[PDB]
Amino acid sequence: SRRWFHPNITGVEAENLLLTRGVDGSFLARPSKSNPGDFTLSVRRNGAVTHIKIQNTGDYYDLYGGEKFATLAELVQYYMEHHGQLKEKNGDVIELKYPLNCADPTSERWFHGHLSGKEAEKLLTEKGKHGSFLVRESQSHPGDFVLSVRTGDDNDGKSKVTHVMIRCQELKYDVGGGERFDSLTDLVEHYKKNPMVETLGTVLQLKQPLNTTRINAAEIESRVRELSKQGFWEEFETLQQQECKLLYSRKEGQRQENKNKNRYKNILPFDHTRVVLHSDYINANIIMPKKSYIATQGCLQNTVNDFWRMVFQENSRVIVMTTKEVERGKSKCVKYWPDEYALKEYGVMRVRNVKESAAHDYTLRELKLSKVGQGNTERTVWQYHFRTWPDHGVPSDPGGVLDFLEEVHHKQESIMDAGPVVVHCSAGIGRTGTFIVIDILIDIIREKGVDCDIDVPKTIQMVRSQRSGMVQTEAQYRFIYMAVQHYIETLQRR
Ligand SMILES: CC1(N)CCN(c2cnc3c(-c4cccc(Cl)c4Cl)n[nH]c3n2)CC1
Fold it and tell me: What is the Cα–Cα distance from 450 to 387, expressed in whole angstroms?
């Protein structure tokens, strides 16, 4: 559910909150507002408060003293069910028992804050379907709210927009009668499941929030203008608040004959999208939006053979490596390719490094992949190794990635019936997710023109349902917008 995350709260406010409205076992999560990628797991225990630091440089949620995780929902869930691992540095144990729910409706998809009643009717008239609703701050009475909901059938005749007053009196919310709720979210969820019925029959059904993220790709520059007043951060954490619906099973990655095949213990592939080898386990996920992807981790020494089994089985002809072998003084991926002009065997597979071509931003390696025994199974697999990506943060200018991405797309289209494009970094969720999302959004634009419809958060959430935590930080989220805008400019400048 992820109500335990408080988006706009200070460190001391979380202390008072756990100590007045919480008991030992209560916990919450919060970001440091000035330091992005800085998160704290504030846990109450032994009549005091324990602050556990979490850092996200772009690849994973690194919990200090603990493990690394793909999302905060998977972090909190892991420790609530695997009790004993979260320890107080000095041996003592931290217990996560009672999620302290937040009341802020800012990170909700349906809450539009300081929005007028005429704008709300226009957007619902234009973009809303049956059941599309929004909640805005009250035009008339300061402090109150208005639930605007569209009903009908999808205009000419019978579709309407009903406005429901939401009174807020002494921190409780109600629709003028019945039950008073502790938050706007609780009120919406209640009438989302038990919808209001009008006096003459019409059911005020809260189906889906009014979409306000889909834009015309031609006006990308206008949306980047408003997201940078903020807009970017409040749009990204609204995306992060929907990760609680993506706790799909990871039973295969958790099995113990597979625990050594994962670079990071608690970053595992979803069971319904994982790549199955013909043992059968590799930390890799099929990503589907004629182009699909394979998002996977950087190879370990004991999974290099499994990696080349996957590349062969999927008929992949392009590999995208978005990491160095060593970054931040730690190994992020094993060298799984032979030296130039050399021929090496990785299990039942054989790879020849035909020729390496060095560019400003990347190294291109023409590799010949074949299976030992079968006489003519050779295929050219092109490895695009991006090297200029920094250790922390994102590139300040998207030009190098876009040209690196344009070259990969041309390569993939030159090969008839080529399989999915293999993308990998360290954990295979951050840079890997940022790359796949940018390529997915560009593939839409390059086909159906610059005046097409793109939805950055809806695209990311779709990709996140196929692999945990695709796109890691807000800096990457912002970089996705900047990359798509730069690509939009270069075509229309041409
Ligand atoms: C004012 C606001 N609080 C912040 C800005 N707006 C939005 C609106 N839709 C979203 C999404 C999104 C879009 C499609 C599917 C899914 Cl699953 C998501 Cl999650 N991600 N992020 C947002 N931000 C309006 C509410």
Answer: 30
